[PDB]
Design an enzyme around this catalytic site. Structure first.
Site, PDB file in Angstrom:
ATOM      1  N   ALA D  99      14.393  49.384  36.149  1.00 17.11           N
ATOM      2  CA  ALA D  99      13.276  48.721  36.807  1.00 17.11           C
ATOM      3  C   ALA D  99      13.687  47.532  37.653  1.00 17.11           C
ATOM      4  O   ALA D  99      12.882  47.082  38.470  1.00 17.11           O
ATOM      5  N   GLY D 144      12.518  44.028  33.704  1.00 15.02           N
ATOM      6  CA  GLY D 144      11.502  44.886  34.278  1.00 15.02           C
ATOM      7  C   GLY D 144      10.802  45.754  33.261  1.00 15.02           C
ATOM      8  O   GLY D 144       9.582  45.699  33.125  1.00 15.02           O
ATOM      9  N   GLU D 254      -2.444  40.324   7.128  1.00 15.85           N
ATOM     10  CA  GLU D 254      -2.822  38.965   6.785  1.00 15.85           C
ATOM     11  C   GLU D 254      -2.236  37.908   7.720  1.00 15.85           C
ATOM     12  O   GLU D 254      -2.407  36.716   7.446  1.00 15.85           O
TER      13      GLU D 254
END
Lengths: 427, 54, 14, 440, 51, 426
Positions: D99, D144, D254
């Protein structure tokens, strides 16, 4: 899987790339014949970026050598590794250009462009996912710069998404050996700015200023100027062939360098170069490598970045080395010296770590830097174009090839935009 | 990874070229260059002898 | 001495 | 039961996944080739591994992980390493071209190309679980595929899976050091588009973990292997109430109900106290109240922002080892009496405690000491409102001249998404302000 | 010519290049085009369907 | 953690720059070829003050040797200890000044400050936390005095908080070797005081008052004068490199010694100087160190405090002694000479003790102290600059190198006030 198709043109382009392939083939354990004779396993894992496969376990490069004279094909075929190249990849015309951009672009280089584009379209479609191309040429000759820009124009009209990269040896100003070279170089920079993704600037003046000052060689030759261009032709593409703690391909350095699509002229430099008597007096640590990327003498262009502002900066580190000490030393150079850095980009540094060093070495380092001190590389070409052009000096050699004087006048002002486009970011 | 943080790694180390006849100095290791001249002085001397006899 | 045996074209050779 | 589906994305996510899954193999009995040394009991002896490891018929345990990347060079030493036989080969997804530090390439162009392949693989691992607690996401904002495709992983998770709990660990960008230049465009645009889609989000940054390995441990020059070892000792202590016997149990549900009061504010910060060296545990007694005080210490924090600048919205203490349930109380009551910690006005209860019996594990050749007690902490603070102000600073810097914006506009993405995802963050800077006011 | 202001008009007043859709398989990234394969319905969308 | 870069200039700056680096390499145990062959392990602890470290166990000094002609500097590369310096550090010009302060200050020396400031910024930012540089040069030639004053002017401006020490070799009045040496040296001491913190004075006439009168040698050499000069260059930085009971770094040796930043002119002396046939007939005892110092025979600058006042006086002891003997001998030589000290500073004597003796010895001492008996050093250099300038004796050597007659004219007008600064305590 991320293949790179090498293109290389002219006597300058065929003598740079012949030494570069002697660098890569040793780095992957390839003999003069082609066979693999290595020891590790990482040497034979991503070899397909640059090498094809022949029969019998013999690897042949993806290099297409281009020339207009037939006398630099015999020099390369019968050199040290001239038997690794497929003989169909050699392209040669039977009459040269003879220091002429027009014979390169229109007259002689247009009958040869349509036979190389039948070669490269056979090597570019034979890749599983082609990452991009390369070029290696000089802006002083006829076939390096004339047809060498005709080729790029046909590539980027045909494969626009792929990466186009150039290692330009732009003409040396004050060790010059051609009267007619500023016509060639001024007419060739409009074709660089619209059709290249990246482009590197190399001066042979500043390759001599390493070999005299840094390495202290007695008699350097062009074999030790090609020996340094290949040092930074392999460090840019070393995270594509060997794994690391942090990777960077040819695209990620392009994403992170150019902020505006007209500003892609850079300045390489290679760090652990040591003179022969000072070899035993130095140790290989991390700040020994960032003191010589960023040293202004080291740069492979004959322009000084203390006169301008670093837009962005790269670094490629090779070895097995610490991610804290990589990261803390590039913050260190940003903070002592903060008038050589543009304001509007807060972090200006991209870093990448590869594991596998050059052979016989422990650590290594490479640089790519983008400057507003590289608009001082074109104004010394403009001053020696319009000093010579205003008296119509060598013009009959170019206009009688089928040109016009207005074609010069646009290449005045299209390169004079890049002088003043870069100028407004120093303001 | 003790070798990265040795206190004596700088002592327990070798330079990249101990002498001109060392095995680990290849083309890609950019310590050894082709145009350094150790045959310079003998070649110049025999050039002068050749000139004298001509 | 020049040795142009590699570079002469296959049309024009000896 | 109690299964957890780990999703690692990016080169950062893979190299953190290699650190954690070596820890999990040693923590249970698993060899590097999958097998246990033979169980030497009648039938199945110990079934504690089922949260992370499945089991075939033959006695081979395959992890519940998916390793994602867009460059081939990072997973190809997972595939040909020591642990090459542990992983089922189809869990390790690679691209062909990466990317390249673009959010836009990793979101619209290359990320959409690869999204539907890995949302078929997480179906198969989520149909093997009898009771699934929730996923885990391991990414970094800088890259990316660590920002772009990871933000689109969370969005298509919300459509398909609804209100299932999607935790995430992250590497927030560092304040002083930085890998890259284009990291503020990445980091702003992904905190905008994961904002209504993520349940919880723990952050550390690498510069703070640098300050501990150099200083507290005696390891000069820490590589990322020494940072990734500490990240695995936080994920293990979050999930050791699911595998080993506890006095007070805490799930993965929790944490969201006890540190995320308000919908836009899901940003707690991790800390781990007795990270100490083997020359300096020969001298120090590590009690239960000696390691409680060192989660509140601004030096031993794991992000480069001081909690003293802000207000503690809540806490979550994770005690692991040979402790007493009474000396957990005997240290919390002390901490509230100091005036150098300051709880927010509308939180008079504060805390969330967890006590687990299995001591932390020694990795062979690792960094830390064989310690008999330990404390982990995830606390949510108003002192993160100084962290976006150093990210609004470096977004509006390069955006007022519009640097690097052409690398995102022509990459399948319009330009009005820049001038709204910094306006979207502009409310979050005042939203952290009004919870910093006392109810007069 | 003002480059800085016109470099921003070129990106805001424009269209995004939509990609040709492509899918993968095998876990080694073998990529195929989507329309030409038989997966996504294309040919019942034709005009003379069923007549 | 307290590195000291060594900065030299000239023929005298190299011939002191050679013998000094011999006797640290014997003090810290270093062979002629660079490596370590020592005995103790206090001989490696604080050795980073002066030596770097290359590979193989190689300690190369942090020294910059500067000259304007290579003739005297080939002798440094091929001496006994000429193969331990890196060859980059030798800075040498191709055309010297040669007994002309004007050549070295504008025309030739401003063209040689270009690359030293690349070299000294390499050897200063390599130090982890630099303690400070140090000068040693000659005021006679134009290499040491013409350009060496311009080295200080640049590096005081770039690195302001750090320390600048000097050993000025100011030439003697009666013995000399240069006609025009008042012009070379009177001119420099006005540009000295603004850019320097602590100065000494080493006159070679005062060295001839030792090797004839104390060491009883018939035939002295300059190599037998650089022994005495460098016996004090180590004696100031001894606390830095070796532990003690009461230490004194060179910061601390000045802060008790400079009441005002124009009172910084000290006259060294040195205790164990004894003839080879008179060696056997003396005991190395605490009174024997302090009886030779305050005697006027020993001092390394030809100027006597019988005229003047011991304004502030320092002391650096080496050896493993009992410090109450240090404490009582200071007081019994302070009460007796009751006219030899000022009274506006009630305690005037400063102390340090260092365990390690100088090599081949047991006990020793070194003295640092200003007086009004060094305005007589500038009464005998600006009486002969006004015995020479009033009728323009050598002036065409000076105005034609890009100067003015104001630059001479302001130089007397420091000698009528900086000397008159010293005068008010009489």
């Amino acid at each position: 899987m991320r293949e790179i198709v090498h293109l290389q043109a002219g006597q300058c382009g065929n003598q740079i790339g012949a030494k570069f392939w002697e660098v890569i083939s040793d780095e992957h354990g390839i003999d003069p014949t082609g066979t693999y004779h290595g020891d590790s396993d990482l040497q034979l894992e991503r070899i397909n970026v640059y090498y094809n496969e022949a029969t019998g376990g013999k690897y042949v490069p993806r290099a297409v050598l281009v020339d207009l004279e037939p006398g630099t094909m015999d020099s390369v075929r019968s050199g040290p590794f001239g038997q690794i190249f497929r003989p169909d990849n050699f392209v040669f015309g039977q009459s040269g250009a003879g220091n002429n951009w027009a014979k390169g672009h229109y007259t002689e280089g247009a009958e040869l462009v349509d036979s190389v584009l039948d070669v490269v379209r056979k090597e570019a479609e034979s890749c599983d996912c082609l990452q991009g191309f390369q070029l290696t040429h000089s802006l002083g000759g006829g076939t390096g710069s004339g047809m060498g820009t005709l080729l790029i124009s046909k590539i980027r009209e045909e494969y626009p998404d792929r990466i186009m990269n150039t290692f330009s040896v732009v003409p040396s100003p004050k060790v010059s050996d051609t009267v007619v070279e500023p016509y060639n170089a001024t007419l060739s920079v409009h074709q660089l700015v619209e059709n290249t993704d990246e482009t590197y600037c190399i001066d042979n003046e500043a390759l001599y200023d390493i070999c005299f000052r840094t390495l202290k060689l007695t008699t350097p030759t062009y074999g030790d100027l090609n020996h340094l261009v290949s040092a930074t032709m392999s460090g840019v593409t070393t995270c594509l062939r060997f794994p690391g703690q942090l990777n960077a391909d040819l695209r990620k350095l392009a994403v992170n360098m150019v902020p505006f699509p007209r500003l892609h002229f850079f300045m390489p430099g290679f760090a652990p170069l040591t003179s022969r008597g000072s070899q035993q007096y130095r140790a290989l640590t991390v700040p020994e490598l960032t003191q010589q990327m960023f040293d202004a003498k080291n740069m492979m262009a004959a322009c000084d970045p203390r006169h301008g502002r670093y837009l962005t900066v790269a670094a490629v580190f090779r070895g097995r080395m610490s991610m804290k000490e990589v990261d803390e030393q590039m913050l260190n150079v940003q903070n002592k010296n903060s008038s050589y850095f543009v304001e509007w980009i807060p972090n200006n540094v991209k870093t990448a770590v590869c594991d596998i060093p050059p052979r016989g070495l422990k650590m290594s380092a490479t640089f790519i830097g983008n400057s507003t001190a590289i608009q001082e590389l074109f104004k010394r070409i403009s001053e020696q174009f319009t000093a010579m052009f205003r008296r119509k000096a060598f013009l009959h050699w170019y206009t009688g090839e089928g040109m016009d004087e207005m074609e010069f006048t646009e290449a005045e002002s299209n390169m004079n935009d890049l002088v003043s486009e870069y100028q407004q970011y120093q303001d | 990874e003790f070798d990265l943080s040795d206190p004596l790694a700088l002592q327990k180390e070798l330079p990249a070229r101990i002498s001109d006849n060392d095995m680990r100095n290849t083309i890609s290791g950019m310590q050894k260059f082709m145009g350094e001249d150790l045959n310079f002085q003998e070649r110049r001397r025999f050039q002068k002898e050749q000139s004298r006899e001509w | 001495r020049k040795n142009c045996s590699f570079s002469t074209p296959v049309p024009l050779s000896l | 039961m109690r299964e957890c589906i780990s999703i690692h994305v990016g080169q950062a996510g893979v190299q953190i996944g290699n650190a954690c899954w070596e820890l999990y193999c040693l923590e249970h009995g698993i060899q590097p080739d999958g097998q246990m040394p033979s169980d030497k009991t009648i039938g199945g002896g110990d079934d504690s591994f089922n949260t992370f490891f499945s089991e075939t018929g033959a006695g081979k345990h395959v992890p519940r992980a998916v390793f994602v990347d867009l460059e081939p060079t990072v997973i190809d030493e997972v595939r040909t390493g020591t642990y090459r036989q542990l992983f089922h080969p189809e869990q390790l997804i690679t691209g062909k071209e990466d990317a390249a530090n673009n959010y836009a390439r990793g979101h619209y162009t290359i990320g959409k190309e690869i999204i539907d392949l890995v949302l078929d693989r997480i179906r198969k691992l989520a149909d093997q679980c009898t009771g699934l607690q929730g996923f885990l996401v391991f990414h970094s904002f800088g890259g990316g595929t660590g920002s772009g495709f990871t933000s689109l992983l969370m969005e298509r998770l919300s459509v398909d899976y609804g209100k299932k709990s999607k935790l995430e660990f992250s590497i927030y960008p560092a304040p002083q050091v930085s890998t890259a230049v284009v990291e503020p465009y990445n980091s702003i645009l992904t905190t905008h588009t994961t904002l209504e889609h993520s349940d919880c989000a723990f952050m550390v940054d690498n510069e703070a973990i640098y300050d501990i390995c150099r200083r507290n441990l005696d390891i000069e020059r820490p590589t990322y292997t020494n940072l990734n070892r500490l990240i695995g000792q936080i994920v293990s202590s979050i999930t050791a109430s699911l595998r080993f016997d506890g006095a007070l149990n805490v799930d993965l549900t929790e944490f969201q109900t006890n540190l995320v009061p308000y919908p836009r504010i899901h940003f707690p910060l991790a800390t781990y106290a007795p990270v100490i060296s083997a020359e300096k545990a020969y001298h120090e007694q590590l009690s239960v109240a000696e390691i409680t005080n060192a989660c509140f210490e601004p030096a031993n924090q794991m992000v480069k922002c001081d909690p003293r600048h802000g207000k503690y919205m809540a806490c979550c203490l994770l005690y692991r080892g040979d402790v007493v349930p009474k000396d957990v109380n005997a240290a919390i009551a002390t901490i509230k009496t100091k005036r150098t910690i300051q709880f927010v006005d509308w939180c008079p209860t504060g805390f969330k405690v967890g006590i687990n019996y299995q001591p932390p594990t020694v990795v062979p050749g690792g960094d830390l000491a064989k310690v008999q007690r330990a404390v982990c902490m995830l606390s949510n603070t108003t002192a993160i409102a100084e962290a976006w102000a150093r990210l609004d600073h470096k977004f509006d810097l390069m955006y007022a001249k519009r640097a690097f914006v052409h690398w995102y506009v022509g990459e399948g993405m319009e330009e009005g998404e820049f001038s709204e995802a910094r306006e979207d963050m502009a409310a979050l800077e005042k939203d952290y302000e009004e919870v910093g006011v006392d109810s007069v | 010519k003002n480059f800085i202001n016109t470099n921003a008009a070129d990106v805001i007043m424009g269209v995004a290049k939509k990609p040709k859709p492509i899918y993968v398989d095998k876990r080694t990234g073998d990529k195929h085009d989507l329309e030409t394969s038989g997966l996504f319905p294309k040919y019942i969308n034709k005009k003379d369907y069923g007549i």
